[PDB]
Amino acid sequence: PMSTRIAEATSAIVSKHPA
Amino acid sequence: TLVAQISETQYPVDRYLDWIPSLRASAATAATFAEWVNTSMKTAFDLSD
Amino acid sequence: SVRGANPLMFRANVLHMLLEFVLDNLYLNRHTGFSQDHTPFTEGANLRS
Amino acid sequence: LLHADTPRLVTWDAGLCTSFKIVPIVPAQVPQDVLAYTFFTSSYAIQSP
Amino acid sequence: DCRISFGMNGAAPMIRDETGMMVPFEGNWIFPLALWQMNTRYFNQQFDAWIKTGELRIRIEMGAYPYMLHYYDPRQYANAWNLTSAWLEEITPTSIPS
């Protein structure tokens, strides 16, 4: 579904804090 | 009138507010927005069909 | 020798490998839907999922 | 002769057409003294192509 | 594009101008907000101390934004870094807070 497709395409590019 | 603002459509009505940022709305995004407009007007005018 | 090979069959074995490499690329690409982008890395781009 | 096996012509690929992958061999020295680890995009878990 | 190079051996780190030059972390800058949204973790980890102490000023272009108002007693000391840093941390590629 489109909600999971959009959520996946925007969860591909994330970034976290360094250790 | 509402879809011609957010999307690329030939239909001219005043092109009015443009300083607010937006995006080139796809068919799916415009279909979502049009569904929200639909259910808002149905809720406003007491329809169920 | 497990670690060895005869150099006089290199051409025959390489072109048989080319034959199998062609025969595993006999398919057709299938349409698998799209989704309009919401993050501004690529504006207005439609990405295949 | 009377009834032969039919071949499977149409086959469909839903992934992406490629044959050449990229593999790393030796790991890059991400903790090193001359350059602080805040330079690298590996520290922020930014995935790269 | 804005690619940050550190300065080896005490040199100041530099970021690339649109014209092609590379400037130190001083003066008046102009960003679009999508630039900051692309890699906000790296951008604010490079820019926190320079905004807090150095003479760096950044103009981020929106057009539109919703706002939020906090009041202070003017006869008492008040610092806004906790709120400003909270906004610059809670910003993300998919959304912004107020």
Q: What Å resolution does this PDB entry report? A: 3.6
Rg, chain E, Cα only: 15
Q: Let me know if B10 is exposed, middle or buried by CB neighbors in 10 A (0-12, 13-18, 19+).
A: exposed
The set of residues, in sequence order, having a beta carbon less than 8 Å from that of B31 and lying 6+ positions away, is none
Interface present between D and B (3 or more CB pairs within 8 Å) = no
Look at residues E31, E37, E39 and name the one whose alpha carbon lies nearest to residue E94.
Answer: E37
Structure-block tokens of residue C1: 């020798």
SS3 A6: helix
In E, minimum Cα distance to C41 occurs at: E38
Interface of E with C in 17-46 (CB under 8 A): 34, 37-38
d(C-alpha D14, C-alpha E31), whole Å: 40
**Residue C48 three-state SS:** strand
Q: Which sign does the torsion angle of CA B36, B37, B40, B42 carry?
A: negative
The kind and range of the H/E element at C46 are strand C46-48
Which residues in chain C touch residue D13, judged by CB atoms under 8 angstroms apart? Answer: 27-30
Q: How far apart are CA C26 and CA C24, in angstroms?
A: 6
With both helix axes pointing from N to C terminus, report the angle between E40-52 and E81-90 in degrees, rounded to the nearest 10.
170
Q: What type of residue sits at position E12?
A: A
Q: In DSSP terms, which residues pair with D12 in a beta bridge?
A: C28
3-state secondary structure chain E: CCCEECCHHHCCCEEECCCCCEECCCEEEEEEHHHHHHCHHHHHHHHHHHHHCCCEEEEEECCCCCCCCCCCCCCCCCCCHHHHHHHHHHCECCECCC
3-state secondary structure of D13: strand
DSSP, residue by residue, C1-35: -TT---GGGHHHHHHHHHHHHHHTS--EE----EE
The kind and range of the H/E element at B48 are: none
Chain C contact set for B25 (CB, 8 A): 36
Q: Can you tell me the distance from the alpha carbon of E66 to that of E56, in angstroms, rounded to the nearest whole number? A: 25
The answer to whether A9 touches C49, Cβ cutoff 8 Å, is yes
Instruction: Name the E strands within D1-49.
Output: 12-13
What are the residues whose beta carbons fall under 8 Å from the beta carbon of D11, sequence distance 6 or more? C26, C27, C28
Between CA C42 and CA B23 the distance in angstroms is 11
CB contact under 8 A, D45 and A12: no
